[PDB]
């Protein structure tokens, strides 16, 4: 008993395998709809250019984590 | 010469097949990206259930005409 499967599942095809300066990277809306075909990271450049980056890769683990710590800074 | 290849390319699947009442219909922001393989309606429904739908229904037609013209309201 599905409901709401005529839905435009937001997915991607290709990812941006070039180490994408954290400047560039003005935000990051993580892909993984159940119906997308494969996950990504919307990695929101500052151009609004929401690039797919494959999250097994090791510069989006990086960059990732300062957008993943980029919204409120923690205190000490 | 690409440029930006990686892109969330957002796009459907299925297609509310379903009259879809035009009040249920909150609003409608026809998929067509270029790398989609299908195009498609986002029938934004009033919870925010975006519905692709098939531009090619007859229901469509007639539902995707009203949100064509449920912004402004025109004069005579």
């Known amino acids: 008993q599905p409901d709401a499967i005529?839905?435009?599942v937001t997915?991607?095809?290709?990812?941006t395998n070039r180490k994408i300066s954290v400047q560039r990277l003005a935000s990051y809306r993580r892909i993984t709809?159940?119906?997308c075909?494969?996950?990504?990271?919307?990695?929101?450049?500052i151009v609004a250019?929401?690039?797919c980056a494959d999250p097994k890769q090791k510069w989006v683990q990086d960059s990732m984590?300062?957008?993943?710590?980029?919204?409120?800074?923690?205190?000490?």
């Open 6 to 8: 005529n839905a435009p």
């Open 33 to 35: 709809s159940s119906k």
């Open 11 to 15: 997915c991607c095809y290709n990812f």
């Open 65 to 76: 984590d300062h957008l993943d710590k980029q919204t409120q800074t923690p205190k000490t």
């Open 49 to 51: 250019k929401e690039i």
């Open 37 to 45: 075909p494969k996950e990504a990271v919307i990695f929101k450049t």
